[PDB]
Amino acid sequence: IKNPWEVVRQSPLDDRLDKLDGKIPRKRGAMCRHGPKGMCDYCTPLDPFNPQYLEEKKIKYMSVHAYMRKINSATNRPELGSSFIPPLVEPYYRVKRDCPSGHPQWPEGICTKCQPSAITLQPQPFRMVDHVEFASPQIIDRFLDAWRRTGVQRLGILYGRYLEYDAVPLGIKAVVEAIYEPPQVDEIDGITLNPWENEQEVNQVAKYCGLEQVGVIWTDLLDAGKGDGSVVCKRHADSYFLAAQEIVFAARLQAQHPKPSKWSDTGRFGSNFVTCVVSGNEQGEISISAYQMSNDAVEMVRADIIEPSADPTLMLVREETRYIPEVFYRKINEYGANVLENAKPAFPVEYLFVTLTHGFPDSPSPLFTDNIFPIENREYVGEAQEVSAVAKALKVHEADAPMNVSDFHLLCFIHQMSVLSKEEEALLCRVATLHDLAESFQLRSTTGWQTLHMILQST
Ligand SMILES: [Zn+2]
Numbered sequence: 001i002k003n004p005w006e007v008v009r010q011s012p013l014d015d016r017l018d019k020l021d022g023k024i025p026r027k028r029g030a031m032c033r034h035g036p037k038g039m040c041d042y043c044t045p046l047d048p049f050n051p052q053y054l055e056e057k058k059i060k061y062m063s064v065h066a067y068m069r070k071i072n073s074a075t076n077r078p079e080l081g082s083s084f085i086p087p088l089v090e091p092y093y094r095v096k097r098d099c100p101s102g103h104p105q106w107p108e109g110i111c112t113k114c115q116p117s118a119i120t121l122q123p124q125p126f127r128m129v130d131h132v133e134f135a136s137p138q139i140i141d142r143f144l145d146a147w148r149r150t151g152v153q154r155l156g157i158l159y160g161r162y163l164e165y166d167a168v169p170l171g172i173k174a175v176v177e178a179i180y181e182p183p184q185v186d187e188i189d190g191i192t193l194n195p196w197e198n199e200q201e202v203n204q205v206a207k208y209c210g211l212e213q214v215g216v217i218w219t220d221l222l223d224a225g226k227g228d229g230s231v232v233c234k235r236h237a238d239s240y241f242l243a244a245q246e247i248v249f250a251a252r253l254q255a256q257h258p259k260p261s262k263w264s265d266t267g268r269f270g271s272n273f274v275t276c277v278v279s280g281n282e283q284g285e286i287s288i289s290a291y292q293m294s295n296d297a298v299e300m301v302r303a304d305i306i307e308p309s310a311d312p313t314l315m316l317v318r319e320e321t322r323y324i325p326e327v328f329y330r331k332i333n334e335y336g337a338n339v340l341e342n343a344k345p346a347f348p349v350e351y352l353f354v355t356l357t358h359g360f361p362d363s364p365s366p367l368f369t370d371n372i373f374p375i376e377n378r379e380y381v382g383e384a385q386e387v388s389a390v391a392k393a394l395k396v397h398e399a400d401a402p403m404n405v406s407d408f409h410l411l412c413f414i415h416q417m418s419v420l421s422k423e424e425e426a427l428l429c430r431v432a433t434l435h436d437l438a439e440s441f442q443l444r445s446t447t448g449w450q451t452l453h454m455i456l457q458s459t
């Protein structure tokens with residue numbers, strides 16, 4: 001029937017990027033001997049994956065689209081149809097499903113044709129997402145307020161959207177518009193997550209805003225003790241940048257957020273879920289570091305093959321409900337040759353993640369402009385969400401004031417109140433994100449809006 005790569009719906013971003021070759025144009029050079037409109041082998045456009053170009057621009061990884069261009073013939077496209085061969089294969093390091101060999105299924109039998117092949121951990125040369133752009137520093141500042149006033153760490157879920165990142169060939173960036181802080185118990189050196197009961201409701205609200213979960217963020221901050229805001233630099237070469245347990249956590253998260261792809265044999269390939277860590281840099285400044293767990297790491301966590309060791313820089317391969325194949329990791333000796341080492345019983349974590357760049361936009365134009373509502377799950381800091389906070393934010397007794405509803409947490413709380421219908425709530429979120437005066441007026445005319453205001457006036 002229809003294959004997986006035929007029925008999956010990609011994002012508009014992926015649809016746009018599929019049509020680009022990403023070739024980097026070039027001008028005449030010192031070795032070119034032709035006119036301003038001729039061409040030779042020294043001025044031909046470069047591939048998006050040209051190693052020399054990426055090295056020259058200090059680009060550590062090529063975009064996943066450039067990687068696809070590299071490994072795939074340009075004629076092989078889904079448009080061909082039945083003759084299309086998806087070039088992307090998502091790692092599968094588990095026993096194969098529905099083995100027609102004769103032996104019983106995995107837990108009771110196994111032949112050489114259904115056992116997984118030997119794993120070879122090499123550094124991933126591509127990254128699904130290339131950049132993490134925060135729409136405004138106020139987002140991170142409001143997030144870190146939790147730690148500033150408590151001294152304990154904090155975790156949040158990044159809500160936003162994916163866009164083209166032009167600074168790198170065929171790049172992609174996650175634009176973060178808000179940080180939702182889910183239920184948790186925070187300590188000076190750890191975070192325990194509690195059941196996120198309303199995750200689907202928050203997802204619905206974000207969808208009304210044209211947003212989605214794009215990653216996770218957490219803090220590893222510790223005041224240096226100089227009364228100047230400086231923090232301790234605890235993540236560095238001589239320690240770690242991501243702990244094995246953190247890598248497993250982020251890998252599980254990525255596995256739960258697969259990216260649909262019309263170029264994969266299974267319709268999905270990799271994940272756009274990014275991971276951000278706020279901590280001290282070599283200058284004692286609060287800074288961000290963006291990462292993504294490799295697809296091999298995600299598959300190994302999917303296969304329950306690895307687990308954290310007592311050393312945060314080392315990952316254990318679990319011993320013999322699961323199958324442990326050969327696991328090597330690749331190194332280079334002093335002679336320059338490639339060497340395969342046995343990753344068992346423990347191997348370095350450096351092979352399990354890739355690094356992303358991050359920043360704020362030139363001139364921020366964020367979707368959510370108003371900070372007028374307490375953030376969720378902050379009772380432990382005396383910050384509680386109440387209907388009175390809604391009445392205050394909506395300035396319900398000051399009829400002469402302008403509408404200010406551009407706050408994601410306010411939108412989530414209002415969704416919780418369950419007063420506006422789906423159409424009314426969609427209009428509210430559209431007004432919050434796009435700020436169209438005519439649509440604000442239209443919202444003020446709705447029956448749900450007036451019901452909400454009558455409710456709010458009686459508190
Ligand atoms: Zn030339």
Ligand SMILES: [Zn+2]
Nearest residue numbers: 099101111114
């Ligand atoms: Zn078999």
